[PDB]
């Protein structure tokens, strides 16, 4: 029922389900909270998604990789490059592979037309030893040269 | 391999009186070099 409510973009309903689990004695695991985060992120709500992640950390549960991927994708869609970098650092602290999230964030920043922040994030990742896909390399080169940015 | 491009140049050229003034600006008017007594 919680995953249903998350699929119809109803974070409030997911909160009702979580409180129902609390009343029933069922401890809220990472899956239900991940559904809450996804429900908040689907309807472009960054503050609510970060509040749900704060509930994650307060509840003592380890957030799933999909939760962090959704958060970084939302930050890239909104152009919040620094928020995405903070989420990537949190992923690194939690012993997670941040390559996929880095690629997703860079691609989202490019799509939303934030070429400056996309370039900065991509260069941070590349100088950090991370390797991007061939398609991402070609996209970065072509977009930067179309914008007249020869340095990047 | 993309070559590590280095584009450095130096060029000579005949100078203009205005650039000479810009160098000086400051005109030497007297032929005296040093004081015979005070060495100033």
């Amino acid at each position: 029922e919680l995953m249903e409510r998350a699929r119809n973009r109803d974070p409030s309903g997911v909160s009702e389900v979580i409180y129902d689990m609390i009343a029933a004695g069922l401890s809220p695991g990472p899956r239900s909270f991940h559904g809450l985060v996804v429900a908040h992120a689907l309807n472009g709500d960054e503050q609510g998604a970060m509040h749900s992640l704060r509930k994650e950390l307060g509840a003592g549960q380890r957030p799933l990789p999909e939760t962090m991927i959704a958060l970084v994708r939302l930050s890239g869609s909104k152009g919040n490059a620094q928020r995405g970098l903070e989420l990537l650092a949190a992923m690194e602290k939690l012993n997670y592979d941040i390559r996929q999230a880095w690629l997703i964030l860079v691609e989202e920043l490019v799509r939303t037309n934030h070429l400056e922040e996309a370039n900065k994030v991509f260069l941070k990742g590349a100088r950090g030893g991370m390797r991007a896909t061939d398609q991402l390399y070609d996209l970065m080169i072509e977009e930067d040269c179309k914008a007249g940015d020869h340095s990047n | 391999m993309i070559d590590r491009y280095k584009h450095q140049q130096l060029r000579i050229g005949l100078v203009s009186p205005q650039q000479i003034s810009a160098w000086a600006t400051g005109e030497v008017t007297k032929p005296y070099t040093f004081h015979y007594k005070t060495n100033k």
Binding site: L57, G58, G60, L87, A89, K93 | D3
Partner: peptide
Amino acid sequence: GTGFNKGDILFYHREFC
């Protein structure tokens, strides 16, 4: 020669316990 070719989340958010 050698000159050729130019030579914080997860903090302040822990489980209260």
